[PDB]
Amino acid sequence: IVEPHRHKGVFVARGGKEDLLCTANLVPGESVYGEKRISVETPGSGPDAVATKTEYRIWNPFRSKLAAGILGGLETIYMKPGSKVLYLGAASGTSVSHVADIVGPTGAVYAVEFSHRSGRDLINMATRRTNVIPIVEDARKPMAYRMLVPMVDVIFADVAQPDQARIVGINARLFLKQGGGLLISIKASCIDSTAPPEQVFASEVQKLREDKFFPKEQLTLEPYERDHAMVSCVYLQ
Amino acid sequence: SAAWPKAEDPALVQELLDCVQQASHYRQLKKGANETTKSVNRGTSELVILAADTQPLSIVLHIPLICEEKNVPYVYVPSKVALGRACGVSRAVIAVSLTSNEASDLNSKIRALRDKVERLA
Amino acid sequence: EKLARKVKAARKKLKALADAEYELELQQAKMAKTATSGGFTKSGRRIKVRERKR
Amino acid sequence: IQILGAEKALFRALKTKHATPKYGIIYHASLVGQASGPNKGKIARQLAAKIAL
């Protein structure tokens, strides 16, 4: 059976020996990358016993840092049906599909990726869904797609860069609202491989903080990842 | 060029090729691009070196993809001949992969070696 | 506990196949056309041929 | 790329301890059909290596 989660648009599917975090399928009948999903119809159709409309793609904390944060116990995710999310580092559009399933038909996901091949799979998924825009550009050059992105509510950041706080810094200084959401996945082995990960996490938080964000909470993703942090902060307020 | 994890000739290349030779003496060594590819796709691989002296480097550019998928460290040394007699083959080995077991000092040397490769990437 | 014990048993199966494939690769060294290094003899000594494959 | 197309005989042989197939789709190229005998499996190997390259 499926009950809602504490967040807006996130669902949790409780079964007999397990539970499965899941979103609502925006384009029904189609799995993106080959994942398990759930079909159910509205009631009054017990005589019918055929699932047609309602559909719920099962969301994997091993293939998604944001599902690793929601199962990691995050306070807010800043994204709701109706939001505008600027996704950074969008390889193949998988977690972009789950974010697009959260913000739904009236929302808008602004997917940015550097690579052309994940660009192509992103154009496949983003041709199937009509709330996600495909942007294949460098995230270190936001003035390339300044004609493409308006002021968004949330920025999600998953790039494996050493200058991650600078990239998200200038992207928020062009595209993120007054008092904006920011949700960064951090890999301590990717920023500084010879330093301890708590010190790398605290130093990246300090670089956001002198980059004039405001850190609300930090959690480490560690039944599902190693040396990964998820920092939830808010721009200028 | 496409060799962005380029190993430096000041003795990191030398420690790479020396650990190649010691793994060759412990039989932990899959030699050549195809057998390297089999070890990475099967996930046995603990570390993988390539050679940037490849005359078309496209024929070894395919394994950094699956090494990024399997999350194993790869690094390029600038001579397939030095890698070839580092293995002990009498031909030019273009890309080598070296696995590990449960308990060996070789596995310790792999651990410290991909610690240095992680200092590169 | 049930998926815990299935994790334990599946890891024991995979380590059994890993040690078995390692034993067969060592016997490819010990049963080779020319003297290669690798493997232990029954004395306890290990076979280290310091040659090259010409 | 040598054994593309012959996976039923191949995993039959590998799970049953028997002779693996020498070639797959490759056999209807212009070269391993040109050879005959042991040259068939031999040029199947080296054509498959050069064709991965």
Partner: peptide, 26 residues
Amino acid sequence: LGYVRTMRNIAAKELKELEERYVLAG
């Protein structure tokens, strides 16, 4: 060795999937 390699391939896939479901249960 061909048989042991194929059985290790199948068992490695089973351990990846079953460990993923295990950490999904806890």
